[PDB]
């Protein structure tokens, strides 16, 4: 059995605020599909800032690509020497039309409740 997948907004993982080898699930919008090297570069906006996450895909071929669309990625993170941070994909589904603010508020509320229950112990 594997470890569970905790949610993480793109900008935190972009800054490397998670330990190496952790399992995380995040979101973003695809920007490029490097065919030969099996690499995916998705992007997510934050005000005037744009953040990039590198996704290895060696475990989900065959895989259709939808340029300029949202995605959900779940897997493990490995801190490479030069490439930086890349997530090893285990499941990679596509969702469209789902509004970000509801999701962001949802994880914020869940984190708040978890911390509140953590105040008794």
């Amino acid at each position: 059995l594997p470890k569970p997948g905790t949610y993480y907004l793109p900008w935190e993982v972009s800054a490397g605020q998670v330990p190496d080898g952790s399992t995380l699930r995040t979101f973003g919008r695809l920007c490029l599909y490097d065919m030969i090297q099996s690499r995916v570069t998705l992007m997510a906006q934050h005000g005037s800032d744009q953040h990039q996450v590198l996704v290895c895909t060696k475990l989900v071929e065959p895989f259709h690509a939808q340029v300029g669309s949202l995605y959900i990625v779940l897997g493990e993170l490995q801190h490479q020497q030069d490439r930086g941070s890349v997530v090893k994909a285990r499941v990679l589904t596509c969702v469209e039309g789902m509004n970000l603010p509801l999701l962001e508020q949802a994880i914020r509320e869940q984190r708040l409740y978890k911390q509140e229950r953590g105040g008794s112990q």
Partner: protein
């Protein structure tokens, strides 16, 4: 499903001692004798020399299975990435004894001889004579040469049978066979047979036999070293490359003997090593130092040091190429 595939594994070969029953006569079925150990000894020499010279593989590690077999563990770098077809080609090139149960003659050699066959026959003469003629005595009984003559054309079957009847020991019969073969080579007259009757019979009764199935697969499994056979308790140990001729199978330490050795080691520790606040690592280190496995682990460590030196050389070469000093 389908994305979980084997990627690399070490190339291995297996040698089964029991696959020589129709040729050997020293023992029966699953029995062994010190006289027949020369078989796997010369097989080891042949295979190791062929690998070291023809292909140039650097690192090799020979392990005695425990009962009747010896395994090869090639662990070089540029070999772990090979596909299945290349390994099949390796095994095909290293195999000469070909045929099933129905086939009698295992060799069909033309006039031309490969350099590999030439090297094998040159390095096989010094061992064939003593072992074959004296120890096993292939040409001893009547049925012995009766099955021998099936390996040669019928044109001289009666003459050779009469010569064997006249002769007394296997040495005289072998000499007469050599003389008859040499006479026939000078008198070759429309014969499909090769000009190396003596060579082909020695290879047929003397060459090792492999199995393509254990090396063709990439996800296959094979016994790890330092195992414990559940029948004789002999621990699988590495075999030194430079002392192969001094390897008696019956002298390998067993699990019961090594356990009694551990008991005696504790007895010595009752008056030699006391009041030690060390972790289990150092205690177990001195434990297996005091045992009978010390030469075997020493050989394993020497091989590991050789591999480490090879890694140092390869990383220094990479540094030279990458201009990083």
């Amino acid at each position: 499903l389908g994305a979980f595939q084997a990627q690399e594994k070490e190339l291995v070969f297996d040698i089964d001692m029991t696959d020589y029953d129709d040729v050997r006569r020293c023992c029966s079925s699953a029995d062994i004798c010190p006289k027949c150990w020369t078989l796997m000894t010369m097989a080891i020499r042949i295979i190791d020399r062929a690998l070291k010279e023809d292909f140039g593989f650097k690192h090799r590690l020979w392990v005695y299975s425990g009962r009747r077999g010896v395994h090869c563990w090639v662990c070089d770098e540029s070999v772990r990435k090979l596909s299945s077809a290349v390994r099949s080609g390796i095994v095909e090139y290293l195999s000469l004894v070909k045929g099933g149960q129905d086939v009698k003659k295992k060799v069909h050699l033309s006039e031309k001889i490969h350099p590999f066959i030439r090297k094998s026959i040159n390095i096989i003469k010094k061992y064939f004579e003593e072992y074959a003629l004296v120890n096993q005595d292939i040409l001893e009984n009547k049925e012995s040469w009766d099955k021998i003559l099936a390996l040669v054309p019928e044109t001289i079957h009666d003459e050779l049978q009469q010569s064997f009847q006249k002769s007394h020991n296997s040495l005289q019969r072998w000499e007469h066979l050599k003389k008859v073969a040499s006479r026939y080579q000078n008198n070759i007259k429309n014969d499909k047979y090769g000009p190396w009757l003596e060579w082909e019979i020695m290879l047929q009764y003397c060459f090792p036999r492999l199995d393509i199935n254990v090396s063709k697969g990439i996800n296959h499994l094979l016994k790890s070293p330092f195992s414990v056979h559940p029948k004789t308790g002999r621990i699988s140990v590495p075999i030194d490359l430079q002392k192969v001729d001094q390897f008696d199978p019956f002298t390998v330490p067993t699990i019961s003997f090594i356990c009694r050795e551990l008991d005696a080691i504790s007895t010595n520790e009752e008056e030699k090593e006391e009041n030690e606040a060390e972790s289990d690592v150092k205690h177990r280190t001195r434990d297996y130092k005091k045992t009978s496995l010390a030469p075997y682990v020493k050989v394993f460590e020497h091989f590991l040091e050789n591999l480490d030196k090879s890694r140092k050389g390869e990383l220094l070469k990479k540094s030279d190429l990458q201009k990083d000093f």
